[PDB]
């Protein structure tokens, strides 16, 4: 429909889901559709739990974690959430700088200056711009739906998306990166039945978009052993079979628009979680990381990995408020929803501690 499609294109609209989904296509091919599916499946549950808690308690999670918790724990949780928003803005700025160097060839620091003046221009109105960004992201989604029809190994795609298996540090690392990019703390911190159905259908169609992106990054070059896998400059140059000369600039414009939109979205979310200036303190790490002399191709995925590092500090407080009687009243969430959410909370920490043990080994 017109509602859910635009809602999905706006709600995902980030360079993290773009970068982490192309890495998985050229490192483990179709064997990461399981990661994508599990990610969206738990993201919808987290969205529903967050909405239920926010409505039945009358406050967002930043306002709640200030009610009943020790002050040092509040400081530690603010450290965690501010590092989360910081990494989100870092990923935004990195994706935008890469898109700018792909479009006009400007170096990533001049691209950061351009993104700063675009943030200045965010404040010839908001009505005309909201259609353009959503239209660009919807067009790139249709472009990848154009390609998902050509993947010859249908049953191989199904079998690789069906059987979950991880092998070594790279597989678990990229899986954690993707599952932390999809399930975002923005989602965790986000006619009621209409809103619920719209969000569910939107996230479902956007999960289809992500599966299409991963399957295309797998079928375009998996065994071709092309020069680079996750270099979004090399990705953009070979991303697409169809409508070639315009496809490269289309991909670059889509990346730039998604980055500039996620900029405002995540920055306003950080302002919400912070007041209950802001743009510069969350921007400085982006500049110091892209100036340190390292290519952003791997840091754009490490940022999603760190967002997954930050997901449990936003997941543990949710269910404790969810399961309560003197607050939820007669509208307490079921015990089975609780059990499913807690199995998910155990699984995420299992994967993250797996990666951490593998890093401790060396």
């Amino acid at each position, epitope marked *: 429909f017109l509602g859910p499609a635009v809602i999905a294109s706006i709600a995902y609209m980030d360079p993290g889901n773009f970068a982490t989904n192309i890495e998985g296509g050229a490192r483990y091919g179709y064997s990461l559709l399981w990661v994508i599916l599990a990610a969206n499946l738990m993201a919808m549950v987290i969205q529903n739990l967050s909405a239920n808690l926010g409505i039945a308690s009358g406050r967002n999670l930043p306002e709640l974690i200030r009610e009943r918790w020790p002050r040092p724990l509040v400081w530690f949780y603010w450290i965690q959430a501010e590092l989360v928003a910081m990494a989100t803005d870092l990923a935004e700025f990195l994706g935008a700088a890469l898109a700018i160097q792909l479009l006009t060839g400007l170096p990533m620091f001049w691209g950061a200056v351009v993104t700063g003046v675009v943030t200045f221009w965010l404040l010839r109105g908001t009505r005309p711009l909201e259609l353009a960004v959503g239209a660009f992201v919807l067009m790139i989604g249709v472009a990848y739906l154009v390609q998902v029809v050509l993947a010859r190994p249908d049953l191989a795609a199904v079998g690789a998306g069906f059987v979950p298996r991880l*092998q*070594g540090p790279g597989s678990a690392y990229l899986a954690v990166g993707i599952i932390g990019a999809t399930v975002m703390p923005h989602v965790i911190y986000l006619l009621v039945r209409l809103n619920r159905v719209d969000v569910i259908a939107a996230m479902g169609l956007a999960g289809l978009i992500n599966m299409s992106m991963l399957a295309v990054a797998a079928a375009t070059f998996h*065994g*071709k*052993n*092309v020069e680079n896998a996750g270099d979004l400059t090399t990705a953009y140059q070979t991303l697409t079979p169809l409508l070639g000369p315009a496809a490269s600039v289309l991909f670059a414009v889509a990346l730039l628009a998604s980055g500039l939109s996620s900029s405002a979205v995540g920055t306003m979310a950080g302002d919400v979680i912070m007041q209950g200036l802001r743009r510069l303190i969350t921007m400085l790490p982006a500049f110091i990381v892209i100036l340190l002399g390292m290519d952003p191709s791997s840091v754009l995925i490490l940022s999603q990995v760190i967002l997954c590092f930050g997901v449990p500090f936003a997941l543990v407080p949710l269910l404790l408020f969810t399961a309560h009687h003197d607050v939820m009243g007669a509208l307490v969430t079921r015990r089975s929803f609780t059990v499913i959410g807690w199995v998910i909370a155990v699984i995420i920490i299992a994967l993250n501690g797996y990666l951490l043990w593998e890093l401790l080994g060396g």
Partner: antibody, heavy 114, light 108 residues
Framework: QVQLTESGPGLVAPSQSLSITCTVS????????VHWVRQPPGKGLEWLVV???????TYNSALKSRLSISKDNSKSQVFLKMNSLQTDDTAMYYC????????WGQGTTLTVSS | DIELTQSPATLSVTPGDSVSLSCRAS??????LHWYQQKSHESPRLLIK???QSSSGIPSRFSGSGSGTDFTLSINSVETEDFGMYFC?????????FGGGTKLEIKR
């Protein structure tokens, strides 16, 4: 200087077993997926199989359920293995992978007759 | 299941006249091709990645020309070190498929 080398030629009876070592040097084997190519003398050649690093074996429909591909990252070797050999499987085997399939092995000869 | 038929089967020429091999496809392959030269009892080095992006360390003699379902590799001013086998391979969809092959020989 990047360089791939292979195992010495082999002469085996039918219904026997065999393995061939494709050892690499100069590049990171754990970062590139190796492809196999079978060429009988003058009889043309067709793409055989690909072992992407970390054990990801994908076989073609032409040669499936008979061949196997092991990998040993400790010495960076790719093992080709065959069981229940037939008469007309004699050929030279190649293993080749660096970024656009540039580097090929010198080739290992393999003959099967009683 | 996509195959590749190569023409001609064998080709004779004297040093000086340009040659051109055609690697006809079974369906549309979006500029996914590979050209290899080979000698007797040797290993084939890579010449042409996808189409006419002359590979690493390849003389400027060889040039590709690419379009959907029919690609052509041409050698201008054939020197004595260009005779032997030539092979064409697609790399888009499993399984990869090599062409019918050609053996460029000497003419007199």
């Amino acid at each position: 200087q990047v360089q791939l080398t292979e195992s010495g030629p082999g002469l085996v009876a039918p219904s026997q077993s065999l393995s061939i070592t494709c050892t690499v040097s100069g590049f990171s084997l754990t970062s590139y997926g190796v492809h196999w190519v079978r060429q009988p003398p003058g009889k043309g050649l067709e793409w055989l199989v690909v072992i992407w690093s970390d054990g990801s074996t994908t076989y073609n429909s032409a040669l499936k359920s008979r061949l196997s591909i092991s990998k040993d990252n400790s010495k960076s070797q790719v093992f080709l293995k065959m069981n229940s050999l037939q008469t007309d499987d004699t050929a030279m085997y190649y293993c080749a992978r660096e970024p656009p399939y540039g580097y090929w092995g010198q080739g290992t000869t393999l003959t099967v007759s009683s | 299941d996509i195959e590749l038929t190569q023409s001609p089967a064998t080709l004779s020429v004297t040093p000086g006249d340009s040659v051109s091999l055609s690697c006809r496809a079974s369906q549309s392959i979006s500029n996914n091709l590979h050209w290899y030269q080979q000698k007797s009892h040797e290993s084939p080095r890579l010449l042409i990645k996808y189409v006419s992006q002359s590979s690493s360390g390849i003389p400027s003699r060889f040039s590709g020309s690419g379009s959907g379902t029919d690609f052509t590799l041409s050698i201008n001013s054939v020197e004595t070190e260009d005779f032997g086998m030539y092979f064409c391979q697609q790399s888009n969809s499993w399984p990869r498929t090599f062409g019918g092959g050609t053996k460029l020989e000497i003419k007199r």
